[PDB]
Symmetry: D2
Subunit: 498 residues, 4 copies
């Protein structure tokens, strides 16, 4: 039992030498420079995020080129994630840049472009032109990350609502709007989102972080926005509304992975419900075998402080226990005063958490929740993990060009690292979002065609030996395909190193 496990935890036992969890960092003014990115990488960055809510294509081209430059110097394969703006709505601008609100007062909330830049404490503009028709009296409007709440009194006009101010707050220029009990009805791929998606496909982004995914058809709408050119790019759906959590199963099947975007989720749903929502989403992704990311205020204090609160440490730790592949940072790396220090702290917590959770428990929990019969592919991948547990394998080597097999091995959560002998550099980059994987790129062009995939295996074993994972005499589980078939692996080997 969990209780029986906790009572026997050895706090001062030696930690795991090889980090299995992955860190995603958003890139902003503090970390756009090649030197700052080299620092982030050297610190523990696996995927560099670009928030497309703000920034020109020139600004986002700089992040792309700099990540490629920094990773090239360090000889790493770092993924680039395009985080879409999505069906998001903010307020207008304010006359003299501010507006103070007192409780008991009344504010007209217009969708009239005349008040777009002339917003006062008496009347102000909001993006959504369908807002007076969506929000009905009694309904609450959550201006600025729910710190200002407005109850709807009446729809005075065609495109204006009279609202009663609940709490004292001073708002400023262009701040986000949330509608909790309101079914929005807005496009997932807006005309801006569409072009944002054609830019990334062109310049080669590895994955998409689709904002405000509500339905299974919404993740399909994004799939169509990336053409045959962007057919292989991953779709990580961001759950940040009530509809998303409600339709989580459909969204999971349609997506390549999921992000528990806790920022907007904590305002769209009550703050206390986010914990239960996170646990439930992460475990559903675990059973599905799809990468799940944790995302907001994980180490928020470290944007201004050199050390995190006791709350942040237990947050990043429990994100790992709940089963997250990745953990992300937003303000911290992008606008923070300690960007390398925050990634380093996250690394220490992730290694501590994974050392406490060195278990065959997650593997058995996930395996038992899978339907029988399995596919020969999955049956080989799950047994490769059980073989590793039985022989105490120091590493699992998978030959996966697309990364399916590597994601399928990682699905069964082994304690050892997973080395992936891939031929595609896109896959080395896309596997930065999957727990325990360590990709190795085989350059097929420079050498030979390689009919018998023996070179790829020797490349993996040698990389595992030199990177100190394996040492002479250790047993290693090799997974690949036989030379009579292709498409998917069907063979598993247990090899003592040389």
């Amino acid at each position: 039992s969990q209780l029986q496990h906790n009572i026997g935890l050895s706090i001062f036992e030696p930690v795991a030498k090889h980090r299995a969890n992955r860190i995603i960092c958003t890139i902003g003014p503090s970390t756009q420079s090649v030197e700052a990115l080299k620092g982030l990488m050297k610190s523990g960055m696996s995927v560099a995020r670009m928030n497309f809510s703000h920034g020109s294509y020139e600004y986002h081209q700089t992040t792309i080129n700099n990540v490629r430059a920094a990773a090239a110097e360090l000889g790493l394969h770092i993924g680039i994630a395009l985080d879409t703006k999505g069906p998001e709505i903010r307020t207008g601008l304010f006359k003299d840049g501010e507006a103070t609100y007192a409780p008991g007062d009344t504010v007209l909330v217009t969708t009239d472009p005349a008040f777009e830049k002339i917003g006062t404490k008496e009347k102000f503009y909001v993006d959504y032109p369908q807002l007076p028709n969506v929000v009905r009296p009694g309904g609450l409007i959550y201006v600025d990350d729910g710190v200002l709440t407005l109850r709807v009194l009446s729809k005075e006009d065609d495109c204006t609502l009279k609202c009663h101010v609940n709490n004292h707050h001073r708002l400023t220029d262009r701040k986000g709007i949330n509608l909790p009990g309101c079914e929005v009805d807005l496009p997932a791929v807006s005309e801006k989102d569409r072009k944002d998606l054609q830019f990334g496909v062109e310049q080669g982004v590895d994955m998409i972080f689709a904002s405000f995914i509500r339905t299974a058809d919404q993740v399909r709408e994004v799939r169509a926005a990336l053409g045959e050119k962007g057919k292989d790019t991953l779709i990580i759906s961001k759950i940040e509304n009530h509809q998303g959590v409600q339709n989580i199963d459909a969204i999971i099947e349609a997506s390549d992975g999921i992000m528990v975007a806790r920022g907007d989720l904590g305002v769209e749903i009550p703050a206390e419900k986010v914990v239960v929502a996170q646990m439930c989403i992460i475990s559903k992704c675990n059973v599905a075998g799809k990468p799940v990311i944790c995302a907001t205020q994980m180490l928020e204090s470290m944007t201004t402080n050199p050390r995190p609160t006791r709350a942040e440490v237990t947050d990043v730790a429990n994100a790992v226990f709940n089963g997250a592949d990745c953990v992300m940072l937003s303000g911290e790396t992008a606008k923070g005063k300690y960007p390398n220090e925050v990634v380093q702290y996250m690394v220490r917590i992730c290694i501590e958490a994974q050392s406490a959770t060195h278990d065959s428990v997650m593997f058995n929990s996930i395996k038992n929740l899978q339907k029988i019969p399995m596919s020969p592919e999955e049956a080989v991948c799950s047994s490769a993990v059980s073989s590793a547990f039985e022989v105490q394998a120091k590493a699992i080597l998978v030959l996966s060009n697309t990364g399916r097999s590597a994601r399928l091995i990682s699905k069964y959560r082994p304690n050892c690292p997973i080395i992936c002998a891939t031929t595609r550099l896109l896959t080395c980059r896309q596997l930065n979002v999957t727990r325990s994987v360590e990709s190795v790129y085989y350059d097929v062009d420079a050498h030979g065609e390689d009919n018998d995939r023996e070179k790829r295996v020797q490349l993996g074993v040698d990389w595992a030996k030199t990177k100190g994972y394996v040492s002479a005499g250790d047993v290693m589980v090799i997974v690949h395909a036989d030379h009579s078939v292709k498409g998917y692996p069907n063979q598993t080997r247990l090899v003592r190193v040389r």
Copy 2:
């Protein structure tokens, strides 16, 4: 499996109608007033905490008298906890209240009382007089939440150390130094802590929160510091050092409960290790059947903000999930701008986490880790919990004068509340540290002898039916003694609530 449980959780299902976890609040300038305390209680303050590291006995007498006045207004029995200063020390005062330190610089750390109030960026005072002989060169001194680090260069004299500043920091008057890794000769109950504990006992404090407990002998030192007048007051030992974690089992046996004081623990041991330490301590206390408290930076952002971070919410929920009886509020309620708002937020998180863990998993886990044979007292108590689970009892009623039986029922973590028909007020206050319990005091003087135990039972069932726990037509598990060999409840009844 936990996986199979999480998968079927219903995010938007209605929450539990009755809160089982308990909230402990530190009292400071923001909440010392009767009106502010009335707000905290009405908010959910179960234990008023007095940090004796700061404040005169007159200031701490005000907190006592005001807590009693406030709980009297709402007709509640709120426990008062005396949190000892203890062994480990704090720095001196500073000239103009502040002093900024830059890396690569040098600071002289004196133990000279002349610099006690005139501390500059060049030289400042520290409480520990034995410090220059304990800290040897190359050793680090940890100042202000272990933020500022000072590497000892050399021993200047009889009571001074020259230190090389590692990081940029500006600290203020009387902020703690930790120095982890040194053979520190500071006692558990110093001459100040004996006067502090003797004050508590003379005042009637319900429990003690003993600071920097390392050994089981230290607990007995504290137990001896409270005399024959303080023989029933609880001893909650604070684990905030490497030794205390290492000797956790011995301290658990010696104590009445444990506090995971994460503040000093996070500096004495690496920050990441505190999670593992918390899980391990809480579960050890669960198996033992002793109240465990989680504390330090639980909802820290709410000292200045009206809403907590996404991290603060998962911290309070996992403290509950880990098996903590209580969750504590330190500066959030003492020096915070939102004291009622922070207790209210903690309440909703505790109820959410509670509603998600509405299972027999914990009881099963705890019960299986008990060695057989059990005492008839514990076998009646554990079976009273299993009976409740089987019939879906909406409440368990225990007749416990000392609270032993109520602490023993709560040990097996039932999903329903535990009503305790106690003849003691001290018991009503001390049971604010144990999960699910809701005490009911039977007069005995302004009532009868009730030798037959019937009046207390009728007082119990009436208190639940009124406080809305039970509704006419649903069972209740009643635990008490049946007129025989003194020393334990031995009888369990299953009764349908009448009208």
Copy 3:
């Protein structure tokens, strides 16, 4: 938690259990009808005496009744009497002057050449038709006139559902005799529909309302309709004799396991029934097969184990009951842990009634304190059957005010009844006399002593109608 991990740690040469939990049911025939033979059987292990109504006049069954009551009275025991009905069965009588021969390839005057009127209509073309123990078979040549059909040499109709009354004209007279006599339970033959059980329940009037109905599963229908049969009954008998012929012999093992476990979860007494120690009808010791058969019937979770002809027509009747006792105690001693208890409790749907929640918790309390015995105050025996449902390791003492329930509790495992005479000792409205009677009986019968903890289950101060109170008492 594995059975494998349990088997590896079995200490075969360890000491056995001090008190036998499983119950033995014996058939009474020419070898054991005498008071002396019955006194021998009881001292040997018998708890219920069976009266096979397939053969015998009401005078003959009256001597079994009177003699069982006499023998039990001398030994001061409360032995139950079971009426096993003739039931619905197709027949064929005495052959060529008592016996002849049939080679492969007037319904009682056949030799070897040429009952149910619904036979050509109930049985469709093709299939199997059984004659004389199922041993001889019948391959129907063509569809024929009257009732009988022309058959080729290669009683019972397999797989297929038959239309025969549950309470035949003979059974009606039998059941009415039983009720008038005061028989404790009925062993209803060839139960196929839960409606048939209620037909039997209606055959015994308000006079026979309290008598138990143990349904005998011995056909395909009874097995495929088990669940409803287990709800309308008071207990079940795995009548393996006719079951082994109605269904393939190999299927009976799986059918036995499945029926016994279903009865365990239901909390109803289940009885294993045919050829359990068959060799001991002629030999002083059993085959290696029969010993493993009795043991596995106990292992499967059977409350009772039965002897049909071993005790009725056997040459070693006391010797066979004694062997069954040794096996039952061995199998019991090997089945020491709370595996069955937890097994059964986890399969119960929540909420439980306060009555069953008190009973199941009384068993868990016993497990926790290592109770030497559980004392239940049960007039009807419901509560005692409910405690036994959760399979405790210790005995259950039942302080009952009714002799009928002292006799009916011989079918429930771990139960030892104690009769409190109200008309003699008093009304005991405070229940202390029946409690002190139970503790004293457990002290003298050596179950408990000084220092031992005992779990005491009964009804409290206000409550009337069901037990709701549990006590843990250290015997003084």
Copy 4:
């Protein structure tokens, strides 16, 4: 997991397993010595033909050998021959040989006669001294080895040293012949662990065990021994009065059916017939019933419960050899494999797969014939002999693998569109596992 939860829910009239996993061992006597009675037994379901050496001349036992080989040859089967050693063998009773049991330094025939201070005499727990390999036993074993008997059923094994005494009696020639130790005493049960390690398999000889120990204790002894052999990964046989009534009757008692089923349920690889086939009036009829019961009991315990029970009782880390074989079984469970193909020459790889009790058969592509006859004692293995001198060398996973696949298709185990698990050794002991669709 929960036996109760599995039993409630069993569907009595569900379709049975098409392929029998459990194995039947028959003693050969006057009723079944003829080639045409043996062909009948083999068709009925005889996997191992036993020869009780307590009775019979070497001429009589040579006839059984030659006839078993003849009958198996006609039917194209590889039937193992087991030599059941005599071992240590024990009113007027004055020893005095002239007045003519065999012990000159008390029960008669399965416990009928008794008293207080050529019929099987048994003195329960008297310090009775007699060697494991007596002068006759050494002569019986040397005959067996010279004849080619596959396995030895060593009588009255009490110590692990006794097993090594028997292993030395066969020597250099009989190094490869299996040693199945018969537990039929008190200390043979007491020293079971030592005896298991020393042996190749165990027999629960319930005949003498039921007399040496109380009759009721044999059930507990059987369960305990079979499960110890299960964890060890060594063939265990159940043995006496299995279907005893069928020596004279065409049908068994309800007790005999539950006894055979229980033996299977307990985890026995094999189940044995003694008199029933040797001196019985219904020898083919008794093997046939035993088959029906074994298939019914198998069908009921179709589950991964035994596999998980055995796997969890193995200490970690496992050898790459056992980690491949146990994973081959879990892969089979996951994909619902219609078979497991193992390329085992000794059979040690096939015994290791059978150890983890899969629901599907284990086809063994063996280069030996001795392996084909010795694998009649392990459950689920259906051997296929590859003639190296006839086809080729075959050091590559090709010809044997093809023969094994073609055999499983013609014998109806696998058809086009079914997944099979192939276990063998790579190019650079087995270390490789393949999951192949039969095509």
